Amino acid sequence: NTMKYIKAADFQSAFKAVNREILENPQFVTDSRIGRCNEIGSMTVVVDTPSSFKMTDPRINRISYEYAEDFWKFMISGGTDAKEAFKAYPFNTFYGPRIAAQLPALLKELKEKPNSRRVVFQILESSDQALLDSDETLEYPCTDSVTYYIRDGKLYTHCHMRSQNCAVVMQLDFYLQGKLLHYIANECGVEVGDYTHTMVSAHVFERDFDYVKGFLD
């Protein structure tokens, strides 16, 4: 039966378990906007040790960590010049500027209101709906929001994904989300608890099945 809740010690184990389950026990096999995929709706993934956001298996190589680190610097710096930022790799929907806008208010709430439930970074917003009936290629944000809260000296993170390509782009999302929760934790002078990753659509495209089978076992 389809397992929808996956607890793992580190990002890699979570990553492999999620991919394994979508390949073997999908909820849907479906034609999507960009091709056929196996899909599991409303997957919940928990990572016990979120300092583990750089995975170690070199066979998971479709997102290089040279690229992922360049992407991190690009998005934490809140820049808009992606053409220049990625020239070594061949209205906007960049996450960086949105995180930058919300940082002062959210950090204030997080540091000053004890045990707050209100610290939510919006990534996807309703103004992005102008992309739906368009022929633009801009990303309609796959990340819906990231919630942070501090209890008893520890920072807990919940990233809610509208849409997640679990074989490829999830490698990048994990890296970026891991870096960001550590940035937030360091700013607040607290330690890290755990990380939770929900995805309304958790999918692997059929064109990537062989790649996935390459890093399982």
Ligand X SMILES: Nc1ccn([C@H]2C[C@H](O)[C@@H](COP(=O)(O)O)O2)c(=O)n1
Residues at the site binding ligand X, with contacts judged by CB under 6 A? 33, 117-118, 139-140, 142-143, 163-165, 169-170, 173
**CA angle centred on 68, ends 64 and 73, rounded to 5°:** 150
Residue appearing with tokens 């583990």? 52
Residues 6 or more apart in contact with residue 94 via CB below 8 angstroms: 75, 79, 80, 82
Q: Give CA torsion, residues 3, 175, 143, 37, to 10 deg.
A: -50
Closest of 44, 3, 41 to residue 196, by C-alpha:
44
Helix or strand (DSSP H, E) at 23: helix 11-24
* Nearer to its own copies (CB atom), residue 41 or residue 79: 41
1 binds, among its own copies, ligand X, none (CB under 5 to 8 A by kind): none
> What residues between 168 and 197 interact with its own copies by CB under 8 A?
196
> What residues between 87 and 106 interact with its own copies by CB under 8 A?
98, 101-102, 105-106
Cβ proximity of 165 and 15 under 8 Å: no
Binding residue for its own copies, selected from 10, 17, 20, 41, defined by CB under 8 A: 41
Binding residue for its own copies, selected from 12, 19, 93, 163, defined by CB under 8 A: 163
Residues that bind its own copies (CB under 8 A): 4-5, 28, 30-33, 39, 41-42, 44, 46, 98, 101-102, 105-106, 108-109, 113-118, 120-122, 124-126, 129-130, 132-133, 140, 144-145, 147, 149, 151-152, 156, 158, 160, 162-163, 196, 198, 200-201
